[PDB]
């Protein structure tokens, strides 16, 4: 996250950290995700696309730091990994960038509720907040597009939703953005999501609930003027989610 503040998981108790193990000893961070229900985490397909070997990923819930433990964290293995059929990547966007990870503990259980682990709510069929709404994104991605490491402490920032009309202007992303995507940016292009933030949530309040309105998917650069962050529009994937959960 460029800008933003550092936080603890208490503040985003549904954020999931996904890592990959290597035959060598190291585990590296891949992407973020969100807990939907006790056994399911939702993220983005582009995060798994190149190495869809579920057995090598580890999911941690209740984690405030990246490579050091937090008291209360839970570790899970990926029992099922569901990527989207119709996922496509072009010279910028990712289409149908949503994925589901069913988690299993080494003891055979799914997540347990704590002060650091909670589920986020899903929206109702094609129901989104209006452009202008301030939503928050959270993650462990880069703080500067030029960095080559990720922060050790979790970060969060608030961004506002912008309309499709604004985002599809030729000097923004043109028709690279579709109705199944959403764009969010800071009015003064100061904060934004970036590499390493993929998969994590864009949360907004809808009808009184903190709802997962988007999943970090792509953007041109990070915090670039007229280059909003694009997210997968969850409200449009509800049928797909349902058929699997």
């Amino acid at each position: 996250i460029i800008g933003g503040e550092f936080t603890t998981i208490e503040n985003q108790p549904w954020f999931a950290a996904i890592y990959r193990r290597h035959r060598g000893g190291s585990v590296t961070y891949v992407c973020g995700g969100s807990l939907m229900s006790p056994c399911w985490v939702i993220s983005a397909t582009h995060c798994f696309i190149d190495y869809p070997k579920k057995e090598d990923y580890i999911v941690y819930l209740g984690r405030s730091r990246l490579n050091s433990n937090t008291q209360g964290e839970m570790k899970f293995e990926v029992e099922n990994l569901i990527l989207h059929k119709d996922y496509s990547a072009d010279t910028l966007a990712h289409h149908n960038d949503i994925a589901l990870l069913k988690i299993r503990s080494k003891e055979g259980r799914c997540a347990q509720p704590s002060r650091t682990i909670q589920t986020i709510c899903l929206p109702s069929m094609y129901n989104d907040p209006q452009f202008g709404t301030s939503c928050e994104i959270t993650g462990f991605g880069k703080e500067a597009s030029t960095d080559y490491l990720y922060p050790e402490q979790l970060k969060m920032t608030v961004v506002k939703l912008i309309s499709h009309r604004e985002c599809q202007q030729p000097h923004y992303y043109g028709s690279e953005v579709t109705t199944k995507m959403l764009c969010a940016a800071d009015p003064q292009w100061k904060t934004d999501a970036c590499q390493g933030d993929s998969g994590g949530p864009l949360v907004c309040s809808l009808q009184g609930r903190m709802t997962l309105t988007g999943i970090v998917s792509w953007g041109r650069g990070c915090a670039l003027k007229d280059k909003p962050g694009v997210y997968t529009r969850v409200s449009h994937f509800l049928p797909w989610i349902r058929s699997h959960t």
């Binding site: 509720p113 609930r209 903190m210």
Partner: peptide, 8 residues
């Protein structure tokens, strides 16, 4: 106690 989605 039990999950209550969106509750911090």
């Amino acid at each position: 106690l039990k999950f209550q989605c969106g509750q911090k």
